[PDB]
Structures are given as structure tokens and as C-alpha cells.
Amino acid sequence: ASRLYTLVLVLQPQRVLLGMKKRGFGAGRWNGFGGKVQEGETIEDGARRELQEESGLTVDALHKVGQIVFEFVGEPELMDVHVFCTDSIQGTPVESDEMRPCWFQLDQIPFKDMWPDDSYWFPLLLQKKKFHGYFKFQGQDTILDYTLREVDTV
Amino acid sequence: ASRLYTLVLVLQPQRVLLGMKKRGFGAGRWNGFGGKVQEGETIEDGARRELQEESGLTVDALHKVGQIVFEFVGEPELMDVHVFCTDSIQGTPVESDEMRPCWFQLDQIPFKDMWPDDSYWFPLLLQKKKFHGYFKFQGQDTILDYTLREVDTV
Numbered sequence: 055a056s057r058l059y060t061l062v063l064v065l066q067p068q069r070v071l072l073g074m075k076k077r078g079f080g081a082g083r084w085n086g087f088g089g090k091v092q093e094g095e096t097i098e099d100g101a102r103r104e105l106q107e108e109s110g111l112t113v114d115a116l117h118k119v120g121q122i123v124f125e126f127v128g129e130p131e132l133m134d135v136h137v138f139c140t141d142s143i144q145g146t147p148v149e150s151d152e153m154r155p156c157w158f159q160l161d162q163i164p165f166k167d168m169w170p171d172d173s174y175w176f177p178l179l180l181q182k183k184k185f186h187g188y189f190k191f192q193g194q195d196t197i198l199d200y201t202l203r204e205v206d207t208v
Numbered sequence: 209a210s211r212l213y214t215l216v217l218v219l220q221p222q223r224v225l226l227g228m229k230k231r232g233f234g235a236g237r238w239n240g241f242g243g244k245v246q247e248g249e250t251i252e253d254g255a256r257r258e259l260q261e262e263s264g265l266t267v268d269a270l271h272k273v274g275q276i277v278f279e280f281v282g283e284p285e286l287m288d289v290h291v292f293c294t295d296s297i298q299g300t301p302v303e304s305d306e307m308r309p310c311w312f313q314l315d316q317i318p319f320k321d322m323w324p325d326d327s328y329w330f331p332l333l334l335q336k337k338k339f340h341g342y343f344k345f346q347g348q349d350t351i352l353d354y355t356l357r358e359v360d361t362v
């Protein structure tokens with residue numbers, strides 16, 4: 055019923071890395087880095103792979119910070135998104151044909167040009183709180199219903 | 209935007225009192241006792257009044273146990289239901305033209321003939337947990353969406 059995805063936020067003391075998607079699903083929005091988890095690959099390894107593929111950064115330690123389930127009206131498959139954070143990275147962000155990474159000061163996170171669910175859970179991530187969320191969408195821009203709570207265990 | 213209601217459950221160690229509504233809103237279902245809160249009356253006093261009016265019982269102490277907000281699609285006014293419990297009552301339940309009270313053993317609560325939200329929050333009430341809930345209904349029988357959580361403070 056659900057498909058596994060990862061989402062990685064590089065969050066440092068005063069700034070966070072986001073990527074502008076240049077084409078495809080979510081073009082024109084800023085977001086974290088991630089994608090589908092592969093056959094035979096752990097969710098964490100998938101998260102590391104996708105951060106490295108999409109941003110050009112090398113990550114050692116990833117930390118589990120959340121789980122978000124997305125439901126899209128009209129679509130049978132739910133998205134089961136495992137959210138991770140890291141402070142410690144190597145390399146510098148790389149712009150590719152698919153993604154333009156940029157650093158944002160924490161007071162200047164571009165919520166109006168991010169997925170609408172981010173306005174709910176990002177503030178939790180910034181204060182190092184872990185969460186479980188569920189968002190029902192109609193299209194890409196409208197949240198019909200949601201739940202969100204803080205958790206001790208992701 | 210919301211209208212105040214009360215709902216009172218008489219919960220003793222091995223049994224709970226419910227009333228079968230004989231006519232009007234909710235006829236044919238078992239439920240707790242309550243109704244609208246009046247001008248100039250506290251919510252607790254409203255709860256005591258309605259228990260006494262509908263069941264014939266006299267209650268001294270009522271305990272706050274929950275808050276449930278109901279939304280009915282097509283209806284502008286939300287219902288803000290303040291839920292109370294008591295163990296200590298006086299008198300014996302009285303059947304009237306409006307209501308038939310009956311005691312139920314805790315393993316025989318008639319959930320299939322109660323409002324559907326009760327299946328979610330009643331088990332919390334039985335284990336002396338306090339809660340906040342929200343239920344979106346289409347008609348009387350269908351929960352479209354809900355949230356429910358345990359709270360320290362009602």
C-alpha cells in the first residue's frame with residue numbers, strides 16, 4: 055500500500071541546505087534531498103545515496119528525525135517518507151541539471167516556495183524535535199487534512 | 209464558530225450508564241447524557257443539570273475528562289463538547305419519554321449502536337485517560353477524518 059522514500063535535510067547551526075528542483079515532480083519548489091529506496095538497500099543507505107546523488111555532498115552519520123505519510127486523492131499508493139537530518143557533511147553543494155542547492159539562514163526559509171506540509175513539520179525539525187505526520191493532498195498545493203505529532207521514537 | 213455542549217458518563221468500577229434516545233437527534237442510539245450549555249451557566253453546571261434532567265440522577269462531583277469538537281459537512285456551526293465523568297451518584301435512573309437509561313458491563317458496551325466516534329474515545333475514558341478529539345462527519349454514520357490524543361490537561 056505504501057512506497058518508501060527518503061528525505062534528507064542538511065541542518066547546521068545557522069543555516070539549512072535546500073535544493074530547487076529544475077524539472078519533473080516538484081519543479082520550481084525548494085526541498086530537501088531524497089528519493090525512492092531501492093531493492094536490497096536499507097532506508098538509511100538510500101537516504102545517503104540520494105543526498106550524494108542530488109546535492110554532491112558526502113554524508114557520514116544520518117539521524118532519523120521523522121516519518122511522514124502522504125496520500126494523494128485519486129492515487130492508490132501512499133508515500134512513506136523517512137526523514138533524516140545531518141549537520142556533518144563533506145564536499146560542497148553541486149548544481150546539476152536536476153537540482154540547484156542553496157543555503158538558507160534559518161529565519162529566511164522560503165516556505166511560500168516549498169511544499170505546504172513543510173510549514174508544519176520544518177519548525178519541528180529546526181528545534182530538533184522528532185515527528186510522525188500524515189498529509190492528505192488534493193493536487194500539489196492543497197492539504198485537505200493532516201495529523202502531526204512529536205515522538206520520542208521515529 | 210462553535211456551540212458548547214456537555215456529555216456526562218456515569219462510570220462505576222464494573223459498569224457504565226448509557227441512555228437510549230427515544231426521539232429526535234440520535235434516536236435509537238445509546239449515549240451519555242448532556243446537551244446545550246445555557247446563558248449565564250458554567251459548563252460544569254450545565255453538565256450537572258443535563259445529567260439530572262435526562263437520567264434522573266443527582267451528581268455532586270463531576271470530573272473533566274475530554275473535549276471533542278464535531279464538524280458536520282454542510283453545517284457552519286461546530287459542536288464543542290465538554291466531556292465529564294462521575295462515579296458518585298444519587299438516586300436511581302429514570303426512564304422518561306425522551307430517554308431510557310440502562311447499565312452496561314464494561315465488556316458489553318454496545319458500540320455498534322452508539323455514535324461511531326465513541327469507539328475511538330470511550331476506551332480512553334474507561335482507562336481514566338483524558339483526551340482531546342476532533343471528528344469530521346458526513347451525516348450521522350460516517351467519519352471522514354479525525355484526530356485524537358491523550359492530554360494531561362483537558
Ligand SMILES: [Cl-]
Nearest residue numbers: 199200353354
Ligand atoms: Cl485528520
